[PDB]
């Protein structure tokens, strides 16, 4: 049971980033792939980026080319994201979605991909 | 990689079956054959929740009414019966390529 | 601290001293966890897949005193004596580390924090080399053998390692446990 926990809402003027936390409980961040998704009326559900276990690094979307950053406070099991490329039209609900980095079959763990547990999400500008 | 969509109106009569689907613009062959595609449902006032973890892999809390079965990139989320409170937005996902995506989102609509 | 326990387990150990820590039932392959606090004897086991890593012993296995923690892994064995006030059902956790891309062990499934202590000693592993036909190790005599099931400190428990499974992120199970183990114990 991952239990993804999100921060509250926050509104800032264009160019200011909002740093959004993602706390997990039952699995440590160490065990989980963290992915971020944006959602809005007129835009739909959009992947921003996330951890890819084969390379074991965060991969960002083809859009949000930069001025987006994802980090992990592994010591507190809390992940973070911020976007400085804010034009206010980017006000959206942001979600932290997680999945196990691996799966297990006996001792062969391959790699696992998915976005199985979502936090409530937060509305931020 | 792009996920296509069937009409998003997905009309609903409760107690009757329903289905939605998508296809891929790119090959879904994963190195291990894993075919990492999945399905989510979003009710109002909440995040989407994943219903089907893989193609045929359903997760607990999700009734047997739901199945993601398909082939040739053409995956259909089948609902054997749409029952009360099964109504919200439905998405197919794509995690077989480095970029990941989502379909537009169909809406079950009574 | 995870409350991983079974119910209605028979006591076959004395006469013969055999005991199974994880009994396995044919029904659903159910794993029944029983890692009791025993009076302080020696034990012996075939140590399949190095599930048994260590053991803990002392007067109370609680605070306001000290207990001895002995744990083996692939590169060394570490022994400490501290006011551990450890978990009633302690285990060495084994989890996948995504950044180092490997499996790692954790003692924080055994105890939380230790209070003030001074004793620590490190040596080469003594439990892990299984030379690969059950090959029983008796407490520290390791001999070849086939499957014939033959030949202050006041109390203790053994420590098993648990290889966490990764099935689903949702709440179907904890996935914490894997495998089964036994050790025969007595005077
Ligand atoms: C078996 O258990 C031992 C005990 O935890 C593991 O070895 C320990 O590994 C850590 C991290 O590499 C060592 O900490 C580092 O020590 C150096 C100085 O030697 C210091 O500069 C670093 O900043 C850091 O503090 C720790 O000393 C080491 N302990 C011992 C007794 O060697 C070992 O890796 C485990 N083996 C397996 C296969 O899991
Ligand atoms: C879990 O174990 C602790 C001691 O380690 C005990 O105090 C607690 O009551 C136990 N909880 C359950 C549900 O068994
Ligand atoms: C494992 O962690 C240690 C920490 O010092 C690091 O030096 C080593 O390069 C890491 N191994 C891998 C595969 O990342």
Q: Which atom of ligand 3 is nearest to the CA of C102?
A: 13
CA Rg, chain B, in Å?
13
Domain of A48 in residue numbering reads as: 5-119
Cβ-in-10-Å burial (0-12, 13-18, 19+) of B74 comes to: exposed
CA proximity to B54, closest of B79, B23, B83, B75: B75
Please state, in angstroms and rounded to a whole number, the distance separating the CA atoms of residues A21 and A119.
Answer: 11
User: Which residues, listed in sequence order, are joined to residue A120 by a DSSP beta bridge?
Assistant: none
Contact by Cβ (8 Å): A49, A33: no
Strands C92-97 and C155-163, bridge-based pairing: parallel
Please state, in angstroms and rounded to a whole number, the distance separating the CA atoms of residues A108 and A21.
Answer: 32
The verdict on the CB of residue C110 being under 6 Å from ligand 2 is no
C61: left (phi over 0), alpha (psi -120 to 50) or beta: left
Please state, in angstroms and rounded to a whole number, the distance separating the CA atoms of residues A31 and A26.
Answer: 10
Residue A124 within any structural domain of the chain: no
Residue A125 within any structural domain of the chain: no
Where b means 16+ CB within 10 Å and e means fewer, A68-77 reads bebebeeeeb
Question: What is the domain count for chain A?
Answer: 1
Domains of chain C: 14-187 (2.60.120.960)
Q: For chain C, after which residues does the C atom lie more than 2.5 Å from the next written residue's N, i.e. where is it broken?
A: 14, 40, 132, 139, 151
Residue A68 within any structural domain of the chain: yes
CATH number, domain containing residue A100: 2.60.40.10
Which ranges of chain A does DSSP label H, i.e. alpha helix?
Answer: none
- Main-chain phi, psi angles of A10, to 5 degrees: -155, 135
Give DSSP secondary structure letters for C78-138.
EEEEE-----SS--EEEEEETTTTEEEEEGGGT-S---S--EEEEE--SS---------EE
Please state, in angstroms and rounded to a whole number, the distance separating the CA atoms of residues C152 and B2.
Answer: 68
The verdict on the CB of residue C114 being under 6 Å from ligand 2 is no
Tell me how far the alpha carbon of residue C75 lies from the centroid of ligand 1, in angstroms.
10
Cβ-in-10-Å burial (0-12, 13-18, 19+) of B47 comes to: buried
- Which residue among A30, A104, A117 sits closest to C169, beta carbon to beta carbon? A117
Q: Closest-CA residue in chain C for A57?
A: C99
Nominal resolution in Å?
Answer: 3.9
Angle at C37 (CA atoms; ends C35, C40), nearest 5 degrees: 125
- Per-residue DSSP letter, A82: E
Chains that touch C (3 or more CB pairs under 8 A): A, B
Please state, in angstroms and rounded to a whole number, the distance separating the CA atoms of residues C16 and C2.
Answer: 31
Using DSSP's 3-state secondary structure scheme, residue C29 falls into: helix
Please count the residue pairs, one from chain A and one from chain C, whose beta carbons lie less than 8 angstroms apart.
56
CA proximity to C11, closest of C34, C27, C29: C34
Using a CB-CB cut-off of 8 Å, the residues of chain C touching A99 are: 169
Q: Which atom of ligand 2 is nearest to the CA of C5?
A: 14
Domains of chain B: 18-107 (2.60.40.10)
Please state, in angstroms and rounded to a whole number, the distance separating the CA atoms of residues B43 and B30.
Answer: 31
């Amino acid at each position: 049971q991952v239990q993804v926990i999100q921060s509250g809402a926050e509104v800032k003027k264009p160019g200011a980033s909002v740093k959004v936390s993602c706390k997990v409980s039952g699995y440590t961040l160490t065990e989980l792939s963290i992915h971020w998704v944006r959602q809005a009326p007129g835009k739909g559900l959009e992947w921003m980026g996330g951890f890819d276990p084969e390379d074991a690094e965060t991969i960002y979307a083809q859009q949000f080319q930069g001025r987006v950053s994802m980090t992990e406070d592994t010591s507190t099991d809390t992940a973070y994201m911020e976007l400085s490329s804010l034009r206010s039209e980017d006000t959206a609900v942001y979600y932290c979605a997680t999945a196990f980095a691996i799966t297990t079959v006996g001792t062969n763990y391959y790699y696992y991909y998915g976005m199985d547990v979502w936090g409530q999400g937060t509305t931020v500008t | 990689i792009v996920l296509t969509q069937t009409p998003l109106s997905s009309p609903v009569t409760l107690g009757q079956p329903a289905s939605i689907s998508c296809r891929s613009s790119q090959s879904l062959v994963h190195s291990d054959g894993n075919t990492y595609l999945s399905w989510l449902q979003q009710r109002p006032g909440q995040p989407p929740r994943l219903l089907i973890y893989k193609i045929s892999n359903r997760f607990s809390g999700v009734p047997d009414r739901f199945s993601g079965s398909g082939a040739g990139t053409d995956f259909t989320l089948k609902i054997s019966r749409v029952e009360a409170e099964d109504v919200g937005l439905y998405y197919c996902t794509q995690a077989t390529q480095f970029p990941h995506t989502f379909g537009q989102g169909t809406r079950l609509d009574i | 601290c995870v409350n991983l326990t079974t119910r209605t387990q028979l006591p076959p150990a004395y006469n013969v001293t055999w005991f199974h820590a994880i009994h396995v039932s044919g029904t659903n392959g159910t794993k029944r966890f029983d890692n009791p606090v025993l009076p302080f004897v020696y034990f012996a086991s075939t140590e399949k897949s190095n599930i048994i890593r260590g053991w803990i012993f002392g007067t109370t296995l609680d605070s306001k005193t000290q207990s001895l923690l002995i744990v083996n892994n692939a590169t060394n064995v570490v022994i400490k004596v501290c006011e551990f006030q450890f978990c009633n059902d302690p285990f060495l956790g084994v989890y996948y580390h995504k950044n180092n891309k490997s499996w790692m062990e954790s003692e924080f499934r055994v105890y939380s924090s230790a209070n003030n202590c001074t004793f620590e000693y490190v040596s080469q592993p003594f439990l892990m080399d299984l030379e690969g036909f059950k090959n029983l190790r008796e407490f520290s005599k390791h001999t070849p053998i086939n499957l014939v099931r033959d030949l202050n400190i006041t109390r203790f428990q053994t420590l098993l390692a648990l290889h966490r499974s990764y099935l689903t992120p949702g709440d179907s199970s904890s996935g914490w446990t894997a495998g089964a183990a036994a050790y025969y114990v007595g005077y």
